[PDB]
Amino acid sequence: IKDAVDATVSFYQTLTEKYGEKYSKMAQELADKSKGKKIGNVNEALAAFEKYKDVLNKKFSKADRDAIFNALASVKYDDWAKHLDQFAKYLKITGHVSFGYDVVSDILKIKDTGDWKPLFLTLEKKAADAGVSYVVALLFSLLAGTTLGIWGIAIVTGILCSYIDKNKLNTINEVLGI
Numbered sequence: 001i002k003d004a005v006d007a008t009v010s011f012y013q014t015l016t017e018k019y020g021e022k023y024s025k026m027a028q029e030l031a032d033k034s035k036g037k038k039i040g041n042v043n044e045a046l047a048a049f050e051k052y053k054d055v056l057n058k059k060f061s062k063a064d065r066d067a068i069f070n071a072l073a074s075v076k077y078d079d080w081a082k083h084l085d086q087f088a089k090y091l092k093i094t095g096h097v098s099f100g101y102d103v104v105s106d107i108l109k110i111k112d113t114g115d116w117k118p119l120f121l122t123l124e125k126k127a128a129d130a131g132v133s134y135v136v137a138l139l140f141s142l143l144a145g146t147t148l149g150i151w152g153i154a155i156v157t158g159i160l161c162s163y164i165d166k167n168k169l170n171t172i173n174e175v176l177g178i
Helices: 002-018 021-034 042-058 062-072 077-081 084-091 103-113 117-130 132-144 150-163 169-176
Strands: none
Touching: 002 021, 002 084, 002 132, 021 084, 021 132, 021 150, 021 169, 042 117, 042 150, 042 169, 062 103, 062 150, 077 132, 084 132, 103 117, 103 132, 117 132, 117 150, 132 150, 150 169
């Protein structure tokens, strides 16, 4: 675990390198906050996310978003899934861990439908008894193995705020500069 924690800190500095300094700390706040929390009413979460999404989408064009799905089409699971255990260790996830879930294939389906409902419901199901910290380990691992455009960072962060009670959804745009 010496490593898990050391590695996580490295992650945080790269987050700072890639995005805001503000961004990186926001991530930590979220990482911290989740420890222990279980996944609540997935509906309340979707509801809050869909509300933030509309705002975000008014600042980016269709073509802008598509660029994000297209970048994701080139990511292979092995590339980011490699960080899963490390995050699980740092977050102290003690419950069961659905290791073999490839979120990226799920997000890709959204490019065509525009429907986020399925994703949320499956994030709840795969977290199982592990709670909200599984969602963090999962998505942080994704961030760890990619360099996405602001829109994608905003969306991924939006999913995190929506499940992790601090609906600091209104602060995302600020932390990112959009």
